């Protein structure tokens, strides 16, 4: 007969449980309280002393009474793994939420696990072509790498990650996991329907993508753990099936935020800006699992919310150290109507390197970056005194930079409704050539608007002729 305790304290997500007998459940164990609806899952967080553990609930605690009976499951929250998760929708505790019955998987795995060791690392430098001009040119992504999309409220993180899914996930070959963490339930509804309509999910056939959700309607315990759940499914595809896996997460900040909602309840003295003191380690224990091993590859794209547009906020600040590439979206750029609202200076890649992209590519990027830099540097003068007060060499640079700014914008296919403009997918090679040519001066006679919201240079010429008419 199993180990049972009694609830002795409840505050929000935190439930203290006393165990009358000798044996206490390990930290990270799943406990269960029987409810008339089913069960409330609790994750053990701390041993408090005097036979009592502190736990974090995975659902709402209203209704709990002191004295309520609690069961130790003997292990951590676990989730189904393998191909039977494909095309399904799963919550934080591995249950199906798609009304299509049990997930008949051979195996379940705990959602907590050690990351691969130093020995098991496997490093590479393979470019992942996106079709997005600003990324492919100025800060390419890495296959088997970690990609973060930073942005304040409403600047384009979800539109961005959806375009990446659109551009990469079909022709990938390996499997994908999408994990909604603390985002919009409706967005999950949207994505499900969209994936069915592209065949990526196929209810009466083969599916390529697993969906895991714990959205912004959920209590913090669930938002704090649901990323581990989606991750565990990706890990299995990687290790046991040697697959190249894609892991998309919107939005990983919500894991850290969730952590901060329970932190005071857990007894922790707060760190800077009210965050948990375990900010960096908690994050490390998560991100370090999202990596490429000798058994297989995981390419990860993660939306990273930026509180109050402040990139030095502890949450996004600590997220930077985990990424091979970082696309930073700017409100100031979005208000100018540049989409994607990418900040060409401030987004980065380990791969912008002659040894990797070739000297030509590398040099075009440097010159584009130099031009944009020169233009930024002059914003003071421009705004106060006017364009008339620049040198002639500097007027030209500003002209050229304004065209480069516009040429970096791009119509996304998933944006066709917002834009009314057909999506464009520009090849890396064509992005390099097109920008090279623009730097060389070959299009100084073309007006600005012709560079705005098109694909390659042919579209610039095309639009220019249209504008001439």
């Amino acid at each position: 007969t199993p180990i049972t305790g009694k609830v002795t304290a409840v505050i929000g997500a935190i439930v203290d449980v006393h165990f009358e007998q000798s044996e206490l459940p390990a930290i990270l164990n799943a406990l269960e309280i029987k409810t008339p609806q089913g069960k409330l899952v609790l994750e053990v967080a701390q041993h408090l002393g005097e036979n009592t553990v502190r736990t974090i609930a995975m659902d709402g605690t209203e209704g709990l009474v002191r004295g309520e009976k609690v069961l130790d499951t003997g292990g951590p929250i676990s989730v189904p793994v393998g191909r039977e998760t494909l095309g399904r929708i799963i919550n934080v505790i591995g249950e199906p939420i798609d009304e299509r019955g049990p997930i008949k998987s051979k195996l379940r795995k705990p959602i907590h696990a050690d990351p691969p060791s130093f020995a098991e690392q496997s490093t590479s430098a393979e470019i992942l072509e996106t079709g997005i001009k600003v990324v492919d040119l100025l800060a390419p992504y890495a296959r088997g790498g970690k990609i973060g999309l930073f942005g304040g409220a409403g600047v384009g993180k979800t539109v961005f990650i959806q375009e990446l899914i659109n551009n990469i996930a079909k022709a990938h070959g390996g499997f994908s996991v999408f994990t909604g963490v603390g985002e919009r339930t409706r967005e999950g509804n949207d994505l499900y329907r969209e994936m069915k309509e592209t065949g990526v999910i196929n209810l009466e056939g083969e599916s390529k993508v697993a969906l895991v959700f714990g959205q912004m309607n959920e209590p913090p315990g669930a938002r704090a753990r649901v990323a581990l759940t989606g991750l565990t499914i990706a890990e299995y595809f990687r290790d046991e099936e040697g697959q190249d896996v894609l892991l998309f997460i919107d939005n990983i900040f919500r894991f850290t935020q969730a952590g901060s909602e329970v932190s005071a309840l857990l007894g922790r003295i707060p760190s800077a800006v009210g965050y948990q003191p375990t900010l960096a380690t908690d994050m490390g224990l998560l991100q370090e699992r999202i990596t490429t091993t000798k058994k297989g590859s995981v390419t990860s794209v993660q939306a990273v919310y930026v509180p109050a547009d402040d990139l030095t906020d502890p949450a996004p600040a600590t997220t930077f150290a985990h990424l091979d590439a970082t696309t930073v979206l700017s409100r100031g750029i979005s208000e100018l109507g540049i989409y994607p609202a990418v900040d060409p200076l401030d987004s980065k890649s380990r791969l912008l390197d002659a040894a990797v992209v070739g000297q030509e590519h590398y040099d075009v990027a440097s010159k584009v970056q130099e031009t944009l830099q020169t233009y930024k540097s002059l914003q003071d003068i421009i705004a106060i005194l006017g364009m008339d007060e620049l040198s002639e060499q500097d007027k030209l640079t500003v002209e050229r930079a304004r065209k480069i700014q516009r040429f970096l914008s791009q119509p996304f296919a998933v944006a066709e409704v917002f834009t009314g403009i057909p999506g464009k997918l520009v090849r890396l090679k064509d992005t390099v050539a097109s920008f090279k040519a623009v730097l060389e001066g070959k299009y100084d006679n073309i007006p600005e608007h012709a560079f705005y919201m098109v694909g390659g240079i042919e579209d610039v010429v095309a639009k220019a002729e249209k504008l001439a008419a």
Partner: protein
């Protein structure tokens, strides 16, 4: 207030207005020192 626009405080606190004040000025001194 006096010198708040023109005078050079630390590098990494520079206006473009500080930068030009020192530019238009250094040139002026150069010309006068050349003549004398």
């Amino acid at each position: 207030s006096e010198g708040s626009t023109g005078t050079p405080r630390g590098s990494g606190s520079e206006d473009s207005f500080v930068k030009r004040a020192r530019a238009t000025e250094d040139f002026f001194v150069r010309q006068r020192e050349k003549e004398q």
